[PDB]
Tab-separated table of C-alpha atoms and ligand atoms in Angstrom:
chain	number	residue	atom	x	y	z
A	1	UNK	CA	-0.014	0.026	0.013
A	2	UNK	CA	1.212	3.478	-1.037
A	3	UNK	CA	-0.538	6.660	-2.085
A	4	UNK	CA	-1.626	6.504	-5.726
A	5	UNK	CA	-2.099	9.465	-8.078
A	6	UNK	CA	-4.821	10.091	-10.664
A	7	UNK	CA	-4.490	10.888	-14.355
A	8	UNK	CA	-7.194	12.586	-16.401
A	9	UNK	CA	-7.745	14.080	-19.792
A	10	UNK	CA	-9.501	16.966	-18.099
A	11	UNK	CA	-9.218	20.450	-19.594
A	12	UNK	CA	-8.351	23.542	-17.511
A	13	UNK	CA	-10.784	25.674	-19.522
A	14	UNK	CA	-14.090	23.803	-19.089
A	15	UNK	CA	-16.395	24.848	-16.264
A	16	UNK	CA	-17.722	21.308	-15.848
A	17	UNK	CA	-16.874	20.358	-12.299
A	18	UNK	CA	-15.236	16.991	-12.973
A	19	UNK	CA	-12.752	18.733	-15.253
A	20	UNK	CA	-12.258	21.534	-12.734
A	21	UNK	CA	-11.547	19.001	-9.979
A	22	UNK	CA	-9.232	16.823	-12.123
A	23	UNK	CA	-7.124	19.777	-13.315
A	24	UNK	CA	-6.606	20.709	-9.688
A	25	UNK	CA	-6.026	17.141	-8.435
A	26	UNK	CA	-4.763	14.907	-11.255
A	27	UNK	CA	-1.861	14.809	-13.740
A	28	UNK	CA	-2.347	14.465	-17.520
A	29	UNK	CA	-2.637	10.930	-18.785
A	30	UNK	CA	0.310	9.587	-20.710
A	31	UNK	CA	0.084	8.150	-24.206
A	32	UNK	CA	3.084	6.136	-22.979
A	33	UNK	CA	1.023	3.095	-21.877
A	34	UNK	CA	3.494	0.233	-21.475
A	35	UNK	CA	1.595	-2.956	-20.595
A	36	UNK	CA	3.865	-5.967	-19.859
A	37	UNK	CA	2.400	-9.497	-19.872
A	38	UNK	CA	3.710	-12.373	-17.731
A	39	UNK	CA	1.976	-15.621	-18.547
A	40	UNK	CA	3.603	-17.978	-15.981
A	41	UNK	CA	3.695	-15.373	-13.237
A	42	UNK	CA	0.399	-15.838	-11.342
A	43	UNK	CA	-0.974	-13.697	-8.514
A	44	UNK	CA	-3.886	-13.562	-6.078
A	45	UNK	CA	-6.449	-10.718	-5.986
A	46	UNK	CA	-9.334	-9.814	-3.672
A	47	UNK	CA	-11.561	-7.083	-5.148
A	48	UNK	CA	-13.222	-6.788	-1.705
A	49	UNK	CA	-9.854	-6.214	0.087
A	50	UNK	CA	-8.282	-3.529	-2.130
A	51	UNK	CA	-7.018	-0.206	-0.811
A	52	UNK	CA	-7.282	1.361	-4.293
A	53	UNK	CA	-11.044	1.201	-3.767
A	54	UNK	CA	-10.738	3.246	-0.564
A	55	UNK	CA	-8.345	5.725	-2.207
A	56	UNK	CA	-10.751	6.258	-5.111
A	57	UNK	CA	-13.644	6.571	-2.589
A	58	UNK	CA	-11.801	9.353	-0.780
A	59	UNK	CA	-11.027	11.081	-4.052
A	60	UNK	CA	-14.677	10.956	-5.224
A	61	UNK	CA	-15.917	12.242	-1.814
A	62	UNK	CA	-13.538	15.193	-2.215
A	63	UNK	CA	-14.840	15.698	-5.738
A	64	UNK	CA	-18.498	15.746	-4.748
A	65	UNK	CA	-18.071	18.054	-1.750
A	66	UNK	CA	-15.950	20.463	-3.784
A	67	UNK	CA	-18.343	20.243	-6.789
A	68	UNK	CA	-21.913	19.638	-5.444
A	69	UNK	CA	-22.030	22.137	-2.575
A	70	UNK	CA	-25.454	21.720	-0.916
A	71	UNK	CA	-27.244	24.788	0.400
A	72	UNK	CA	-27.568	22.930	3.709
A	73	UNK	CA	-25.531	20.001	5.036
A	74	UNK	CA	-26.913	18.345	8.153
A	75	UNK	CA	-24.422	16.103	10.039
A	76	UNK	CA	-24.116	15.248	13.704
A	77	UNK	CA	-26.301	17.898	15.244
A	78	UNK	CA	-24.563	20.618	13.212
A	79	UNK	CA	-25.581	22.306	9.955
A	80	UNK	CA	-23.311	23.852	7.332
A	81	UNK	CA	-24.588	26.416	4.790
A	82	UNK	CA	-22.785	27.527	1.665
A	83	UNK	CA	-23.503	28.784	-1.813
A	84	UNK	CA	-25.205	26.064	-3.870
A	85	UNK	CA	-25.191	27.180	-7.491
A	86	UNK	CA	-26.369	24.995	-10.353
A	87	UNK	CA	-23.353	23.640	-12.139
A	88	UNK	CA	-22.363	21.673	-15.259
A	89	UNK	CA	-22.120	18.016	-14.230
A	90	UNK	CA	-20.898	15.190	-16.490
A	91	UNK	CA	-18.426	12.569	-15.210
A	92	UNK	CA	-15.138	12.086	-17.007
A	93	UNK	CA	-12.745	9.077	-16.928
A	94	UNK	CA	-10.088	8.850	-14.222
A	95	UNK	CA	-6.978	6.674	-14.187
A	96	UNK	CA	-5.273	5.554	-10.989
A	97	UNK	CA	-1.508	5.167	-11.079
A	98	UNK	CA	1.140	3.689	-8.813
A	99	UNK	CA	3.998	6.087	-7.992
A	100	UNK	CA	7.678	5.332	-8.615
A	101	UNK	CA	8.763	2.139	-6.918
A	102	UNK	CA	5.298	0.632	-7.440
A	103	UNK	CA	3.407	-1.061	-10.264
A	104	UNK	CA	-0.200	-2.128	-10.829
A	105	UNK	CA	-0.896	-5.748	-11.716
A	106	UNK	CA	-3.938	-6.398	-13.936
A	107	UNK	CA	-5.639	-9.784	-14.349
A	108	UNK	CA	-6.191	-10.619	-18.020
A	109	UNK	CA	-8.534	-13.540	-17.364
A	110	UNK	CA	-11.676	-12.505	-19.192
A	111	UNK	CA	-13.746	-14.765	-16.846
A	112	UNK	CA	-12.145	-13.679	-13.533
A	113	UNK	CA	-14.713	-13.186	-10.772
A	114	UNK	CA	-12.516	-10.715	-8.892
A	115	UNK	CA	-11.236	-13.153	-6.256
A	116	UNK	CA	-8.533	-15.766	-6.140
A	117	UNK	CA	-5.579	-16.667	-8.389
A	118	UNK	CA	-5.121	-15.265	-11.867
A	119	UNK	CA	-2.566	-16.976	-14.061
A	120	UNK	CA	-2.349	-14.392	-16.834
A	121	UNK	CA	-1.232	-11.166	-15.168
A	122	UNK	CA	0.181	-7.978	-16.656
A	123	UNK	CA	1.954	-4.983	-15.122
A	124	UNK	CA	0.851	-1.389	-15.965
A	125	UNK	CA	1.441	2.131	-14.722
A	126	UNK	CA	-2.260	3.085	-14.539
A	127	UNK	CA	-5.703	1.647	-14.590
A	128	UNK	CA	-8.045	2.395	-17.437
A	129	UNK	CA	-10.328	5.448	-17.387
A	130	UNK	CA	-13.061	5.069	-14.798
A	131	UNK	CA	-16.102	7.352	-14.596
A	132	UNK	CA	-16.974	8.070	-10.952
A	133	UNK	CA	-20.687	7.394	-11.583
A	134	UNK	CA	-22.550	7.449	-8.251
A	135	UNK	CA	-25.687	5.311	-8.489
A	136	UNK	CA	-27.678	2.523	-6.819
A	137	UNK	CA	-29.253	-0.686	-8.068
A	138	UNK	CA	-27.972	-0.158	-11.602
A	139	UNK	CA	-24.331	0.424	-12.548
A	140	UNK	CA	-24.135	3.091	-15.281
A	141	UNK	CA	-21.575	3.928	-17.942
A	142	UNK	CA	-19.089	1.324	-16.851
A	143	UNK	CA	-17.071	-1.200	-18.867
A	144	UNK	CA	-18.451	-4.510	-20.087
A	145	UNK	CA	-17.203	-8.026	-19.536
A	146	UNK	CA	-15.466	-9.354	-22.608
A	147	UNK	CA	-16.949	-12.837	-22.620
A	148	UNK	CA	-19.734	-14.162	-20.326
A	149	UNK	CA	-21.655	-12.337	-17.653
A	150	UNK	CA	-19.691	-12.452	-14.410
A	151	UNK	CA	-21.107	-12.799	-10.842
A	152	UNK	CA	-18.942	-11.231	-8.098
A	153	UNK	CA	-19.508	-11.264	-4.339
A	154	UNK	CA	-17.329	-11.365	-1.203
A	155	UNK	CA	-19.413	-14.279	0.085
A	156	UNK	CA	-22.218	-15.763	-2.018
A	157	UNK	CA	-23.482	-17.779	0.962
A	158	UNK	CA	-23.776	-14.652	3.081
A	159	UNK	CA	-27.048	-12.989	2.052
A	160	UNK	CA	-25.871	-9.614	3.428
A	161	UNK	CA	-22.925	-9.196	1.065
A	162	UNK	CA	-23.638	-7.244	-2.090
A	163	UNK	CA	-23.693	-9.140	-5.404
A	164	UNK	CA	-22.196	-7.359	-8.389
A	165	UNK	CA	-23.474	-8.524	-11.762
A	166	UNK	CA	-21.085	-7.616	-14.600
A	167	UNK	CA	-22.963	-7.600	-17.931
A	168	UNK	CA	-21.424	-8.351	-21.306
A	169	UNK	CA	-23.918	-6.261	-23.381
A	170	UNK	CA	-25.241	-2.864	-22.339
A	171	UNK	CA	-28.897	-2.008	-21.755
A	172	UNK	CA	-29.655	1.541	-22.802
A	173	UNK	CA	-31.669	3.655	-20.326
A	174	UNK	CA	-32.958	7.157	-21.091
A	175	UNK	CA	-34.040	9.191	-18.113
A	176	UNK	CA	-35.640	12.578	-18.606
A	177	UNK	CA	-37.479	15.338	-16.830
A	178	UNK	CA	-39.011	17.007	-19.895
A	179	UNK	CA	-39.845	20.613	-20.613
A	180	UNK	CA	-44.856	19.221	-11.711
A	181	UNK	CA	-41.216	20.235	-12.189
A	182	UNK	CA	-39.923	17.308	-10.147
A	183	UNK	CA	-41.573	14.489	-12.154
A	184	UNK	CA	-39.398	12.521	-14.619
A	185	UNK	CA	-39.320	9.136	-16.291
A	186	UNK	CA	-36.860	6.539	-17.608
A	187	UNK	CA	-37.364	4.435	-20.756
A	188	UNK	CA	-35.812	0.970	-21.082
A	189	UNK	CA	-36.374	-1.296	-24.070
A	190	UNK	CA	-38.012	-4.333	-22.483
A	191	UNK	CA	-36.699	-6.958	-24.925
A	192	UNK	CA	-33.076	-6.186	-24.156
A	193	UNK	CA	-34.040	-6.239	-20.465
A	194	UNK	CA	-35.792	-9.576	-21.030
A	195	UNK	CA	-32.767	-11.282	-22.620
A	196	UNK	CA	-30.391	-9.638	-20.100
A	197	UNK	CA	-32.358	-10.905	-17.096
A	198	UNK	CA	-32.684	-14.422	-18.488
A	199	UNK	CA	-28.918	-14.728	-19.021
A	200	UNK	CA	-28.426	-13.244	-15.516
A	201	UNK	CA	-30.790	-15.892	-14.222
A	202	UNK	CA	-28.695	-18.537	-16.007
A	203	UNK	CA	-25.474	-17.510	-14.205
A	204	UNK	CA	-27.270	-17.074	-10.869
A	205	UNK	CA	-28.568	-20.589	-11.363
A	206	UNK	CA	-25.068	-21.817	-12.021
A	207	UNK	CA	-24.202	-20.543	-8.510
A	208	UNK	CA	-27.524	-21.945	-7.270
A	209	UNK	CA	-27.899	-25.151	-9.387
A	210	UNK	CA	-34.236	-26.418	-7.683
A	211	UNK	CA	-33.449	-22.773	-6.962
A	212	UNK	CA	-35.957	-20.870	-9.134
A	213	UNK	CA	-34.490	-17.394	-9.521
A	214	UNK	CA	-36.789	-14.508	-8.574
A	215	UNK	CA	-36.255	-10.757	-9.221
A	216	UNK	CA	-38.320	-8.559	-6.880
A	217	UNK	CA	-38.109	-4.824	-6.097
A	218	UNK	CA	-36.154	-3.467	-3.193
A	219	UNK	CA	-37.455	-4.501	0.260
A	220	UNK	CA	-37.135	-1.283	2.221
A	221	UNK	CA	-34.781	1.437	3.489
A	222	UNK	CA	-33.911	4.990	2.554
A	223	UNK	CA	-35.304	6.165	-0.782
A	224	UNK	CA	-31.805	6.257	-2.190
A	225	UNK	CA	-31.495	2.479	-2.009
A	226	UNK	CA	-35.121	1.461	-2.588
A	227	UNK	CA	-35.002	3.302	-5.934
A	228	UNK	CA	-32.529	3.645	-8.761
A	229	UNK	CA	-30.996	6.907	-7.480
A	230	UNK	CA	-28.364	8.795	-9.394
A	231	UNK	CA	-27.203	12.265	-10.404
A	232	UNK	CA	-27.842	13.575	-13.918
A	233	UNK	CA	-26.815	17.134	-14.944
A	234	UNK	CA	-26.531	17.933	-11.274
A	235	UNK	CA	-30.042	16.840	-10.311
A	236	UNK	CA	-30.766	13.970	-7.939
A	237	UNK	CA	-33.061	11.478	-9.789
A	238	UNK	CA	-34.903	8.862	-7.741
A	239	UNK	CA	-36.445	6.309	-10.120
A	240	UNK	CA	-38.926	3.572	-9.219
A	241	UNK	CA	-37.760	0.119	-10.224
A	242	UNK	CA	-40.900	-1.902	-9.251
A	243	UNK	CA	-41.504	-2.704	-12.936
A	244	UNK	CA	-37.829	-3.483	-13.558
A	245	UNK	CA	-36.701	-6.036	-10.910
A	246	UNK	CA	-39.921	-8.052	-11.297
A	247	UNK	CA	-39.756	-11.496	-12.916
A	248	UNK	CA	-39.113	-15.200	-12.526
A	249	UNK	CA	-36.517	-17.512	-14.084
A	250	UNK	CA	-37.634	-21.170	-13.901
A	251	UNK	CA	-36.936	-24.373	-15.871
A	252	UNK	CA	-34.367	-22.453	-17.904
A	253	UNK	CA	-36.696	-19.676	-19.097
A	254	UNK	CA	-37.312	-16.112	-17.925
A	255	UNK	CA	-40.710	-14.477	-17.648
A	256	UNK	CA	-41.030	-10.740	-16.862
A	257	UNK	CA	-43.811	-10.011	-14.377
A	258	UNK	CA	-43.307	-6.254	-14.303
A	259	UNK	CA	-45.720	-3.987	-16.166
A	260	UNK	CA	-44.678	-2.682	-19.583
A	261	UNK	CA	-46.458	-0.780	-22.368
A	262	UNK	CA	-45.892	-1.210	-26.105
A	263	UNK	CA	-42.577	-2.853	-25.425
A	264	UNK	CA	-40.815	-0.462	-23.063
A	265	UNK	CA	-40.600	-0.158	-19.267
A	266	UNK	CA	-40.921	3.381	-17.942
A	267	UNK	CA	-39.645	4.102	-14.451
A	268	UNK	CA	-41.383	6.937	-12.613
A	269	UNK	CA	-39.002	9.276	-10.865
A	270	UNK	CA	-38.778	12.405	-8.682
A	271	UNK	CA	-35.954	14.962	-8.664
A	272	UNK	CA	-35.403	15.349	-4.931
A	273	UNK	CA	-33.792	18.172	-2.904
A	274	UNK	CA	-33.261	16.388	0.410
A	275	UNK	CA	-30.665	13.706	-0.127
A	276	UNK	CA	-29.374	11.057	2.230
A	277	UNK	CA	-25.691	11.447	1.574
A	278	UNK	CA	-23.572	8.480	0.507
A	279	UNK	CA	-20.271	10.182	1.497
A	280	UNK	CA	-21.170	10.050	5.199
A	281	UNK	CA	-24.153	9.763	7.583
A	282	UNK	CA	-26.100	12.964	7.022
A	283	UNK	CA	-28.390	14.874	4.717
A	284	UNK	CA	-27.753	17.386	1.949
A	285	UNK	CA	-30.118	20.061	0.777
A	286	UNK	CA	-29.997	21.485	-2.774
A	287	UNK	CA	-31.912	24.039	-4.776
A	288	UNK	CA	-34.940	23.074	-6.895
A	289	UNK	CA	-34.144	21.705	-10.365
A	290	UNK	CA	-32.940	23.691	-13.394
A	291	UNK	CA	-35.229	24.798	-16.236
A	292	UNK	CA	-35.544	22.845	-19.440
A	293	UNK	CA	-34.987	19.302	-20.717
A	294	UNK	CA	-32.920	17.368	-18.131
A	295	UNK	CA	-31.952	14.076	-19.782
A	296	UNK	CA	-29.266	11.398	-19.418
A	297	UNK	CA	-28.908	8.601	-21.946
A	298	UNK	CA	-26.821	6.032	-20.151
A	299	UNK	CA	-25.731	2.419	-20.528
A	300	UNK	CA	-26.636	-0.144	-17.878
A	301	UNK	CA	-23.410	-2.148	-17.547
A	302	UNK	CA	-24.027	-3.901	-14.251
A	303	UNK	CA	-26.386	-4.640	-11.364
A	304	UNK	CA	-26.230	-4.443	-7.569
A	305	UNK	CA	-28.266	-7.253	-5.994
A	306	UNK	CA	-28.994	-8.651	-2.550
A	307	UNK	CA	-30.329	-12.145	-1.915
A	308	UNK	CA	-33.160	-12.770	0.529
A	309	UNK	CA	-37.876	-23.671	-2.483
A	310	UNK	CA	-36.380	-20.632	-4.230
A	311	UNK	CA	-33.945	-17.690	-4.048
A	312	UNK	CA	-35.140	-14.125	-4.479
A	313	UNK	CA	-32.910	-11.238	-5.638
A	314	UNK	CA	-33.606	-7.563	-5.062
A	315	UNK	CA	-31.709	-4.453	-6.211
A	316	UNK	CA	-29.187	-3.202	-3.696
A	317	UNK	CA	-26.395	-0.708	-3.312
A	318	UNK	CA	-25.767	2.494	-1.300
A	319	UNK	CA	-22.061	1.830	-0.627
A	320	UNK	CA	-20.490	3.278	-3.809
A	321	UNK	CA	-17.280	1.446	-2.923
A	322	UNK	CA	-19.018	-1.413	-4.698
A	323	UNK	CA	-19.428	0.899	-7.736
A	324	UNK	CA	-15.655	1.396	-7.696
A	325	UNK	CA	-14.936	-2.312	-7.118
A	326	UNK	CA	-16.877	-3.148	-10.236
A	327	UNK	CA	-14.096	-1.462	-12.211
A	328	UNK	CA	-11.029	-1.936	-9.909
A	329	UNK	CA	-11.337	-5.690	-9.567
A	330	UNK	CA	-8.632	-6.600	-12.098
A	331	UNK	CA	-6.058	-4.398	-10.377
A	332	UNK	CA	-3.618	-4.850	-7.468
A	333	UNK	CA	-1.019	-2.251	-6.443
A	334	UNK	CA	2.377	-3.896	-5.960
A	335	UNK	CA	5.830	-2.884	-4.854
B	1	7IW	C1	-26.899	-2.998	2.932
B	1	7IW	N1	-26.547	-1.654	2.514
B	1	7IW	C2	-25.640	-0.975	3.471
B	1	7IW	C3	-25.788	0.581	3.283
B	1	7IW	C4	-27.088	1.170	2.851
B	1	7IW	C5	-27.182	2.532	2.693
B	1	7IW	C6	-26.071	3.384	2.943
B	1	7IW	C7	-24.852	2.868	3.329
B	1	7IW	C8	-24.686	1.453	3.497
B	1	7IW	C9	-23.795	4.077	3.498
B	1	7IW	C10	-22.488	4.093	2.788
B	1	7IW	C11	-21.344	4.759	3.568
B	1	7IW	C12	-19.886	4.377	3.134
B	1	7IW	O1	-19.683	4.731	1.829
B	1	7IW	C13	-18.787	5.089	3.928
B	1	7IW	O2	-18.264	6.236	3.258
B	1	7IW	C14	-24.628	5.323	3.331
B	1	7IW	C15	-24.717	5.863	4.785
B	1	7IW	N2	-24.932	7.307	4.855
B	1	7IW	C16	-26.250	7.807	5.276
B	1	7IW	N3	-27.180	6.983	5.512
B	1	7IW	N4	-26.445	9.044	5.336
B	1	7IW	C17	-26.022	4.876	2.807
B	1	7IW	N5	-25.947	5.151	1.368
B	1	7IW	C18	-26.600	6.394	0.818
B	1	7IW	O3	-27.125	7.144	1.598
B	1	7IW	C19	-26.566	6.722	-0.678
B	1	7IW	O4	-26.004	5.961	-1.492
B	1	7IW	N6	-27.198	8.001	-1.084
B	1	7IW	C20	-27.208	8.520	-2.506
B	1	7IW	C21	-27.059	9.850	-2.729
B	1	7IW	C22	-27.031	10.407	-3.998
B	1	7IW	C23	-27.200	9.527	-5.060
B	1	7IW	CL1	-27.180	10.141	-6.737
B	1	7IW	C24	-27.339	8.191	-4.866
B	1	7IW	F1	-27.491	7.368	-5.909
B	1	7IW	C25	-27.348	7.618	-3.591
B	2	NAG	C1	-14.189	-16.979	-7.687
B	2	NAG	O1	-13.264	-17.956	-8.134
B	2	NAG	C2	-12.419	-18.514	-7.066
B	2	NAG	C3	-11.415	-19.443	-7.720
B	2	NAG	O2	-10.630	-18.750	-8.689
B	2	NAG	C4	-13.291	-19.217	-6.036
B	2	NAG	O3	-12.520	-19.637	-4.962
B	2	NAG	C5	-14.396	-18.276	-5.567
B	2	NAG	O4	-15.296	-18.990	-4.688
B	2	NAG	C6	-15.180	-17.717	-6.710
B	2	NAG	N1	-16.185	-16.763	-6.229
B	2	NAG	C7	-17.370	-16.629	-6.822
B	2	NAG	C8	-18.324	-15.652	-6.200
B	2	NAG	O5	-17.673	-17.296	-7.830
B	3	NAG	C1	-23.047	-12.861	-22.792
B	3	NAG	O1	-23.010	-13.962	-21.850
B	3	NAG	C2	-24.070	-14.888	-22.049
B	3	NAG	C3	-23.895	-15.964	-20.948
B	3	NAG	O2	-23.814	-15.378	-19.693
B	3	NAG	C4	-24.030	-15.483	-23.437
B	3	NAG	O3	-25.134	-16.343	-23.608
B	3	NAG	C5	-24.072	-14.368	-24.482
B	3	NAG	O4	-23.913	-14.937	-25.796
B	3	NAG	C6	-22.919	-13.397	-24.231
B	3	NAG	N1	-22.956	-12.350	-25.201
B	3	NAG	C7	-21.904	-12.030	-25.952
B	3	NAG	C8	-20.667	-12.829	-25.737
B	3	NAG	O5	-21.933	-11.098	-26.787
B	4	NAG	C1	-19.007	-17.336	3.816
B	4	NAG	O1	-19.966	-17.640	4.884
B	4	NAG	C2	-20.121	-19.004	5.133
B	4	NAG	C3	-21.221	-19.154	6.136
B	4	NAG	O2	-21.620	-17.900	6.693
B	4	NAG	C4	-18.775	-19.645	5.601
B	4	NAG	O3	-18.934	-21.039	5.762
B	4	NAG	C5	-17.690	-19.344	4.583
B	4	NAG	O4	-16.430	-19.746	5.143
B	4	NAG	C6	-17.619	-17.838	4.262
B	4	NAG	N1	-16.565	-17.542	3.273
B	4	NAG	C7	-16.452	-17.947	1.995
B	4	NAG	C8	-17.463	-18.895	1.449
B	4	NAG	O5	-15.498	-17.577	1.282
B	5	NAG	C1	-42.507	2.149	-6.536
B	5	NAG	O1	-43.799	2.121	-7.128
B	5	NAG	C2	-44.672	1.151	-6.567
B	5	NAG	C3	-45.973	1.214	-7.364
B	5	NAG	O2	-45.988	2.360	-8.157
B	5	NAG	C4	-44.899	1.458	-5.071
B	5	NAG	O3	-45.717	0.436	-4.524
B	5	NAG	C5	-43.568	1.524	-4.355
B	5	NAG	O4	-43.748	1.924	-2.996
B	5	NAG	C6	-42.622	2.528	-5.058
B	5	NAG	N1	-41.311	2.570	-4.410
B	5	NAG	C7	-40.858	3.606	-3.764
B	5	NAG	C8	-39.496	3.484	-3.144
B	5	NAG	O5	-41.500	4.659	-3.739
B	6	NAG	C1	-44.569	-6.421	-10.388
B	6	NAG	O1	-45.364	-5.413	-11.016
B	6	NAG	C2	-46.785	-5.517	-10.780
B	6	NAG	C3	-47.447	-4.454	-11.572
B	6	NAG	O2	-46.617	-3.314	-11.681
B	6	NAG	C4	-47.022	-5.422	-9.258
B	6	NAG	O3	-48.416	-5.569	-9.008
B	6	NAG	C5	-46.254	-6.503	-8.551
B	6	NAG	O4	-46.447	-6.446	-7.135
B	6	NAG	C6	-44.766	-6.411	-8.882
B	6	NAG	N1	-44.006	-7.491	-8.214
B	6	NAG	C7	-43.435	-7.382	-7.031
B	6	NAG	C8	-43.614	-6.055	-6.352
B	6	NAG	O5	-42.839	-8.296	-6.514
B	7	NAG	C1	-39.593	-9.695	-23.767
B	7	NAG	O1	-40.316	-8.473	-24.210
B	7	NAG	C2	-41.073	-8.593	-25.430
B	7	NAG	C3	-41.704	-7.218	-25.699
B	7	NAG	O2	-40.760	-6.234	-26.022
B	7	NAG	C4	-42.099	-9.701	-25.240
B	7	NAG	O3	-42.968	-9.710	-26.377
B	7	NAG	C5	-41.330	-11.003	-25.047
B	7	NAG	O4	-42.281	-12.076	-25.000
B	7	NAG	C6	-40.495	-10.924	-23.770
B	7	NAG	N1	-39.737	-12.150	-23.635
B	7	NAG	C7	-39.557	-12.735	-22.460
B	7	NAG	C8	-38.703	-13.997	-22.506
B	7	NAG	O5	-40.032	-12.306	-21.418
B	8	NAG	C1	-23.398	8.341	-19.420
B	8	NAG	O1	-22.674	8.866	-20.529
B	8	NAG	C2	-23.451	9.665	-21.415
B	8	NAG	C3	-22.491	10.122	-22.489
B	8	NAG	O2	-21.502	11.085	-21.990
B	8	NAG	C4	-24.063	10.848	-20.682
B	8	NAG	O3	-24.911	11.540	-21.558
B	8	NAG	C5	-24.853	10.351	-19.465
B	8	NAG	O4	-25.348	11.465	-18.726
B	8	NAG	C6	-23.995	9.503	-18.610
B	8	NAG	N1	-24.741	8.986	-17.475
B	8	NAG	C7	-24.530	9.430	-16.196
B	8	NAG	C8	-25.422	8.820	-15.148
B	8	NAG	O5	-23.678	10.258	-15.929
C-alpha cells in the first residue's frame, strides 16, 4: 500500500466540475502506456480487500463536496450552509497510477470473478479510465465483460454481502425530466431487459444449481437504495424500479412479471432536494431543479443485487465502494 495518483484528460478551460476538480488534483494521462504481460507469473487478487477502492472513494468524496455544494448540510447535530449554484455536471474518466517504486498488476482472465488466483497477469502504470458514476441498483456507464456475464461477491452464501453482476452487453436507459417540475421518467427497451435478465438468471442458477431465480423490487430502506437513485446534470433523480426487478426464471426460461407498455418499461422518478448522503451519515439540501430538458442517456453495464424452495434477488447498493470495485477488480497495487 502506497498513495496513488490520478491521471485525467480533463481540460483547464471547461467549467464542468469533474474537469475543474481533475485539473486541480490529477496529472495528464500519458500516451506512454506500457503494458507488460507475464503468462507464468500468477498472482492472487481480492476485489473486496483492495485499498485502491478506498483511495478512489476518498477522491470521489472530495470531488463531490468540492463540486456539489449543498445549500444545507446536516451532520451530527450541526448544519453547514454555503453557496449552492447550479453547475455543469458530467463525469469524465479517471486513471489511478502507482508512484515510482510501485506497479499495478492487472488480471487478463476474461472470466475472472474478482477473487482468487489469476494465471495471466500484466503490469501497468495506470488503470483504465473510470467514470466516478454514483448510483444505486444499476451500474451506469461502466465497462463490459469481454466474454460471459460475471457474478462477483465477497461471500455468495452470506445474504448480506452485495452481489455485483457484470454484464457483457449494455442495456440503454434514457431518463428525462421533460420541458410538476420534479416528475421525470426513464425508458428501457423491455426486450433487451428480457434477454439480459434471463442470461443473468442462467448464471445465478449456476451458482444456485431447484433454486428458481426471482427478481423482486427493493425491500425497504432509505429512498436512495429502494430506488434507482443517481445524479444527472446535477439533479438527484430517484427512479422507481418496481416494474424492472420483477420477474421469474424457472426451468431455464425467464418471464417478466413487471408492467410494460408497447414494449418499453418506464420508471417513474422524482428529482429530490433532500438527499441522504452516500459520502457520510447525514443529509444534503439542494436548490430546486434547473429549467428545461434534463436528460441522461446512459448504458446499464451492471447490477447491484441482494439475496433474501427458491432464491429471491432484489436491487441493492448504497455503498458506492461497490461501484468502484466493479471497475477496480482486475487491479492490485504492488511494490
Ligand atoms: C446493505 N446496505 C448498506 C448501506 C445502505 C445505505 C447506505 C450505506 C450502506 C452508506 C455508505 C457509507 C460508506 O460509503 C462510507 O463512506 C450510506 C450511509 N450514509 C447515510 N445513511 N447518510 C447509505 N448510502 C446512501 O445514503 C446513498 O448511497 N445515497 C445516494 C445519494 C445520491 C445519489 Cl445520486 C445516490 F445514488 C445515492
Ligand atoms: C471465484 O473464483 C475462485 C477461484 O478462482 C473461487 O475460490 C471463488 O469461490 C469464486 N467466487 C465466486 C463468487 O464465484
Ligand atoms: C453474454 O453472456 C451470455 C452468458 O452469460 C451469453 O449467452 C451471451 O452470448 C454473451 N454475449 C456475448 C458474448 O456477446
Ligand atoms: C461465507 O460464509 C459461510 C457461512 O456464513 C462460511 O462457511 C464461509 O467460510 C464464508 N466464506 C467464503 C465462502 O469464502
Ligand atoms: C415504486 O412504485 C410502486 C408502485 O408504483 C410502489 O408500490 C412503491 O412503494 C414505489 N417505491 C418507492 C420506493 O417509492
Ligand atoms: C410487479 O409489477 C406488478 C405491476 O406493476 C405489481 O403488481 C407486482 O407487485 C410487482 N411485483 C413485485 C412487487 O414483486
Ligand atoms: C420480452 O419483451 C417482449 C416485448 O418487447 C415480449 O414480447 C417478449 O415475450 C418478452 N420475452 C420474455 C422471455 O419475457
Ligand atoms: C453516461 O454517458 C453519457 C455520455 O456522456 C451521458 O450523456 C450520461 O449522462 C452518462 N450517465 C450518467 C449517469 O452520468
